Subunit: 229 residues, 2 copies
Amino acid sequence: ELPAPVKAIEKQGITIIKTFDAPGGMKGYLGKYQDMGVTIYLTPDGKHAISGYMYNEKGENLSNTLIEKEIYAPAGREMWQRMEQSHWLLDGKKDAPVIVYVFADPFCPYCKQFWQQARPWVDSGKVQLRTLLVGVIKPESPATAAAILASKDPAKTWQQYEASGGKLKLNVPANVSTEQMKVLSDNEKLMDDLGANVTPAIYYMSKENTLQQAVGLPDQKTLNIIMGN
Amino acid sequence: ELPAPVKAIEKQGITIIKTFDAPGGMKGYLGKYQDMGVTIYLTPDGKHAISGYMYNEKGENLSNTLIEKEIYAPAGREMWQRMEQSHWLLDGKKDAPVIVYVFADPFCPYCKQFWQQARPWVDSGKVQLRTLLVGVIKPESPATAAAILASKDPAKTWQQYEASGGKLKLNVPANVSTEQMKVLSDNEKLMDDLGANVTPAIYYMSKENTLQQAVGLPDQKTLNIIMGN
């Protein structure tokens, strides 16, 4: 069966995922304790095993890197893809290295405050905000979101809208077009799939491409992390 | 200097105590993170180090054993000795394998309830309670404690006293003898040195002879552990 030392560790509440190659003639075992990832290393003598974190000369926590890359990160990747494939509005340079998605409603105070908080990074060309509009807060939310999508330059209109705190006057069409409705409905479903029904729902990448989330108005630390600072 | 991998771990907030021999050509480092003991193992390749717990074939957490034996346990040993050298009253068989010390005052409800809780273990001959009397709760506490110490068979009188909930009538002398006063004062100082001014203050050994403490009336789990069950 499994080496005795490792079996002893399983009894401490660990469920093994797979084995992997480690340095120094040591064999590695990747597993989980409840929702936490763990790495186990069988010693050369083969009669001992160490549950913990391995660091290299450069000081990198290899265990952490492996755990984030193989356990925490994967599942959310397809979601990041779905957002990229959605009809988002661009705020910032197309080549900005840091990408941040935000599900926003036109009648959402924190959506506007977050928009303002992000200006330094967006204007510097470091961050690009990709907004996925939804109409879920107020009765007029759908029509207003669609009106923005119907404007000559949706991205610019959204920016002006957020900058003005929603005071920007708009040309609201006689009805929501079928395409606009599809966009809103699709975005709302994706947002729902991500687990957060409150706007703004902010998504970004960090920790070995782990899909991260922020809901509501981020505080200073969260803001700096979202911005990739 | 120290191997690079280990130096990286020190930067994570660990202070090294000493090095030690580990299996498989691995070198061990014993240290602390805040008040927590930690063990680090340098890999055979020498370019990696693992911060964690080592288990053997039998399933023993060797790291835990070392940490308890060398870090957590030592400091309190001299205290356990001081209690043994004090004038305690015996409740149970002199050869009972489990020794428990209790600082008690005559006017202490929980002292009496704990005394009752312990009967099964004391009567079975598994546990012996060694009581160090103190007179700190009530004005009459000193005189009453001394009266018990002045009786023909102090240990028996104390047992009867606790069993009767303090209703046992006593012969209270004209004054506290110098020897009795020395005992009470010495016991009070030792109790104070142990960190707990509330009675009952219960002390026992567990986790590689770590001096353990219980204050007040122990709940069912603590009671079973104190009793060595």
